[PDB]
């Protein structure tokens, strides 16, 4: 490995770990990519870095400009650590219904937070971010529209999976938030390596928007955005699979308990999908790869841990 | 990277990141090794894996046996994920001062917790664990005595530093808890690569036991054990340096804020010492390497985040 000139350069190179007890009695192989092991501990670190780097290259972002994005979750954390490592002023807009601890993490990187009325929800944070981003000197990455999001997974996540498995990956299963992960990995495998792979998107059964149903409330943070994102390319996805909130929560708990993998709720969702796919007779002896986006300690205040006080 | 057959094999291979703003105006070069990027997110993952593997190879640990260890933080977490990954019953002793968040992390891996009197500290934990380990069928790794602890650093941490710097490491600065990190890296560089390295042990000014002062209470968790561990090899250490709780907490805040590196209190302690050493005239144009043991989210409930409510 090189010496990274700042922490944003250290994204990726995450490990593939074989799942052993949740797969007991299957003849396929299930490998988990641990995206929790990133400079700011989630998969979003890849796109926080890539969207900043790409805006530098194109001139949309210049030194002294202000970065603004409407986000509570992992994307705010990634942008915060990247802007701190690379020296940009950062503002994040979020409804005031935001956990005091997620805000501490964001403020530890020196991000400025703009709370918008909780009643207007996410669309209120988006409106404020658009208003701020309209002024000159401010840049908005736009995580759901920015092609630099799937492109970094074409350049890093995709190749890492291809090379760590030595070309043995027959199924890729990924929860879909912005959809950049599943789009970039599928593009790399199918178009750049010409590799046959069955690509499965995972969404909450309570908000099955990718399969055409109506958005709803759900607890699988980071996926189920309530719309089909522009960064999600349905043409490289072969199947949509939904999981319940309880399946996701329980499978994340079993990943820690039975595999020693501390991970979040959407990790349980992805794995719960992957293990159902991996039980199909047509995939006997095949390799199923899935992504676990972040780590369990980010979920101490959530429903993931409520059974442990 | 290979496919890891379980999560314990995925230890290490952590990045070296150049520190840029905290070093502004020094002519030396300070590189931070990010041990938060480990399967259970601390440096102890290396020795949790290694001590279990070593006990398996030696026959001191067999399938069906019960693992027991005293811990005040990361060693419990490391052993917990390893025992979940590899299938051992685990019981940890710890003072009742252990935060609720730490307990929950240990419970998520299915470890049993035995609480010892808070005012008796680590020594009261060590004694209850020794008691429990007397039972036939029980095994105690003994993190302060087990040579498998510095050995894994001779085998992984040392070589990673040597390889990523291409033999450019003139100073090694590390906080001492068990001392295995500094002992193993220093043995590797001095005894095996025959490389001249100024090796700096960092301990709390409020508990300068390595320097022969009295044990005292302090907030730099993970270091300042209150005694000199057998796994600390004084013959490979060139200098003992004290840092205040205030220095450590503030420097950990500055690493997040000015570098985008979210890390723990002991990380600020090591960096506070590394920056002092790196400003010395004899190290102009030289390379100083230090270890940042874990990640910031483990410390939300601590004095590290007191300034953010």
CATH of the domain at B163: 3.40.50.1100
Residues B138 and B175 in one domain: no
Report the 10 Å Cβ neighbour count for A99: 12
In angstroms, the CA B256 to CA A105 distance is 9
**Computed from CA positions of residues B255, B261, B263, B267, in that sequence, does the dihedral angle turn out positive or negative?**
negative
Place of tokens 């940009």: A88
Residues B117 and B155 in one domain: no
In angstroms, the CA A91 to CA A28 distance is 46
In angstroms, the CA A58 to CA A51 distance is 11
Evaluate whether B203 touches B211 at the Cβ level (below 8 Å): yes
| d(CA B265, nearest CA chain A) in Å | 13
In angstroms, the CA A259 to CA B81 distance is 8
Which residues face A204 on adjacent strands?
A: A243
Strands (E), B197-308: 198-204, 239-243, 287-292
Tell me the chain B residues in contact with residue A107 when contact means C-beta distances shorter than 8 Å: 308
In angstroms, the CA A241 to CA A208 distance is 9
Q: Which domain holds residue B90?
A: 45-145
Residues present in chain A in total: 309
Tell me the chain A residues in contact with residue B107 when contact means C-beta distances shorter than 8 Å: 308
Reading the block at residue B16, the tokens are: 């070296």
Residues A213 and A238 in one domain: yes
Nearest CA in chain B to A3: B16
DSSP tally for chain A: helices H, then strands E: 9, 10
Q: Is B16 helix (H, G, I), strand (E, B) or coil?
A: strand
Query: Does the CB of A40 have a partner CB in chain B at under 8 Å?
Result: yes
Q: State the DSSP string of A204-237.
A: ETTS-TTTT--------TTS--SS--TT--GGG-
> Per the CB < 8 Å rule, is B308 touching A108?
yes
B260 is in an annotated binding site: no
| d(CA A259, nearest CA chain B) in Å | 4
Phi-psi map region of B242: left, alpha, beta (phi>0 left; psi -120 to 50 alpha): beta
Q: What is the structure's resolution, reported in angstroms to one decimal?
A: 2.0
Q: Is B287 helix (H, G, I), strand (E, B) or coil?
A: strand
**Cα dist. A300→A73, A265, A297, B226 in Å?**
14, 11, 6, 30
Q: How was this structure determined?
A: X-ray
Q: Is B88 helix (H, G, I), strand (E, B) or coil?
A: coil
Residue B8 is nearest to which of A39, A260, A308, comparing CB atoms? A260
Evaluate whether A269 touches A176 at the Cβ level (below 8 Å): no
Q: In what order do the strands lie in the sheet with B112-116?
A: B112-116, B89-95, B66-70, B138-139
What's A192's DSSP letter? I
Residue A210: φ, ψ to 5°? -65, -30
Evaluate whether B260 touches A7 at the Cβ level (below 8 Å): yes
Q: Is B193 helix (H, G, I), strand (E, B) or coil?
A: coil
Residues A102 and A249 in one domain: no
Instruction: Count Cβ neighbours within 10 Å for each residue of B67-80 and write b for 16 or more, e otherwise.
Output: bbbbbbbbbbbbbb
Alpha helices in chain A (DSSP H): 44-58, 74-86, 100-108, 121-133, 148-152, 158-164, 180-187, 245-259, 265-278
> Per the CB < 8 Å rule, is B20 touching A6?
yes
Residues A256 and A211 in one domain: yes
Residue B104 is nearest to which of A101, A109, A305, comparing CB atoms? A305
Q: Is B232 helix (H, G, I), strand (E, B) or coil?
A: coil
Which site among A260, A265, A268 would you substitute to test the B interface, given the most B Cβ atoms closer than 10 Å to its Cβ? A260
Phi-psi map region of B185: left, alpha, beta (phi>0 left; psi -120 to 50 alpha): alpha
Residues A38 and A160 in one domain: yes
CA B224 to mean position of chain CA atoms: 11
Reading the block at residue B174, the tokens are: 């590390």
Reading the block at residue A257, the tokens are: 């308990």
Query: Does the CB of B44 have a partner CB in chain A at under 8 Å?
Result: no
Burial of B177 from C-beta contacts in 10 A (0-12 / 13-18 / 19+): buried
Evaluate whether A287 touches A241 at the Cβ level (below 8 Å): no
Reading the block at residue B105, the tokens are: 């992390």
Alpha helices in chain B (DSSP H): 44-58, 74-86, 100-108, 121-134, 148-152, 158-164, 180-187, 245-259, 265-278
Residues B241 and B139 in one domain: no
Which of B145, B163, B198 corresponds to the end of one domain?
Answer: B145
CA B205 to mean position of chain CA atoms: 18
Q: Is B175 helix (H, G, I), strand (E, B) or coil?
A: strand
Which of A121, A145, A169 corresponds to the end of one domain?
Answer: A145
Reading the block at residue B110, the tokens are: 């299915």
Residues B4 and B87 in one domain: no
Evaluate whether A47 touches A36 at the Cβ level (below 8 Å): no
In angstroms, the CA A11 to CA A50 distance is 9
> Per the CB < 8 Å rule, is B13 touching A20?
no
Among the listed residues B125, B100, B50, the one whose alpha carbon sits nearest the alpha carbon of residue A305? B100
B72 is in an annotated binding site: no
Catalytic entry in B44, B128, B190, B286: B44
Evaluate whether B28 touches B279 at the Cβ level (below 8 Å): yes
In angstroms, the CA A128 to CA A130 distance is 5
Say if strands A16-18 and A29-34 run parallel, antiparallel, or are unpaired: antiparallel
In angstroms, the CA B306 to CA B292 distance is 21
Among the listed residues B183, B175, B178, B174, the one whose alpha carbon sits nearest the alpha carbon of residue B150? B183
Nearest CA in chain B to A104: B308
Residues B162 and B279 in one domain: yes
Among the listed residues B87, B79, B112, B51, the one whose alpha carbon sits nearest the alpha carbon of residue A20? B87
Residues B197 and B92 in one domain: no
> Per the CB < 8 Å rule, is A7 touching B1?
no
In angstroms, the CA A262 to CA A36 distance is 9
Reading the block at residue B113, the tokens are: 């917790």
Residues B58 and B80 in one domain: yes
What's B280's DSSP letter? S
> Active-site residue A128, yes or no?
no
Say if strands B239-243 and B198-204 run parallel, antiparallel, or are unpaired: parallel
Evaluate whether B140 touches B133 at the Cβ level (below 8 Å): yes
| Tally of structural domains, chain A | 2
Which of B128, B145, B162 corresponds to the end of one domain?
Answer: B145
Residue B3 is nearest to which of A5, A16, A85, comparing CB atoms? A16
Among the listed residues A116, A153, A120, the one whose alpha carbon sits nearest the alpha carbon of residue A231? A153
Residues B227 and B274 in one domain: yes
**Cα dist. B58→A273, B53, B153, B218 in Å?**
40, 9, 19, 37
Query: H/E element holding A139?
Result: strand A138-139
> Per the CB < 8 Å rule, is B260 touching A41?
no
**Cα dist. A252→A104, A245, B40, B249 in Å?**
24, 11, 15, 33
């Amino acid at each position: 490995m090189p010496i990274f000139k700042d922490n944003s350069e250290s994204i990726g190179r995450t490990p593939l770990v074989q799942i052993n007890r949740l797969t007991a009695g299957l003849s396929s192989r299930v490998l988990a990519k641990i995206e929790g092991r990133n400079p700011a501990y989630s998969v979003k670190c890849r796109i926080g870095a890539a969207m900043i780097w790409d805006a530098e290259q194109s001139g949309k972002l210049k030194p002294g400009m202000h970065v603004v994005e409407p986000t509570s979750g992992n994307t705010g954390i990634a942008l915060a650590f990247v802007c701190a490592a690379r020296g940009y002023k950062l503002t994040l807009t979020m409804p005031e219904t935001m956990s005091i601890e997620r805000r501490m993490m964001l403020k530890s990187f020196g991000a400025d937070l703009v709370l918008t009325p909780g009643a207007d929800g996410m669309k209120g944070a988006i409106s404020k971010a658009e208003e701020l981003a309209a002024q000159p000197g401010w840049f908005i990455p736009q995580q759901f529209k920015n092609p630099a999001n799937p492109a970094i997974h074409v350049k890093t996540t995709g190749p890492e999976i291809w090379n760590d498995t030595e070309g043995q990956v027959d199924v890729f299963v990924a929860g879909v938030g912005t959809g950049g992960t599943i789009t970039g990995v599928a593009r790399f495998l199918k178009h750049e390596k010409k590799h046959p792979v069955h690509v499965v998107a995972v969404e909450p059964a309570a908000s099955p928007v990718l399969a055409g149903g109506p958005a709803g409330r759900h607890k699988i943070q980071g996926i189920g955005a309530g719309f089909v994102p522009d960064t999600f390319d349905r043409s490289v996805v072969d199947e949509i699979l939904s999981v319940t909130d309880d399946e996701a929560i329980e499978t994340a708990r079993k990943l820690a308990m039975e595999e020693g993998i501390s991970c979040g709720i959407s990790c349980g969702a992805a794995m719960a999908g992957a293990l159902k796919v991996a039980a199909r007779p047509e995939f006997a002896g095949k390799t199923i790869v899935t992504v676990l986006p972040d780590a369990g300690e980010r979920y101490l205040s959530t429903a993931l841990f409520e059974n442990l006080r």
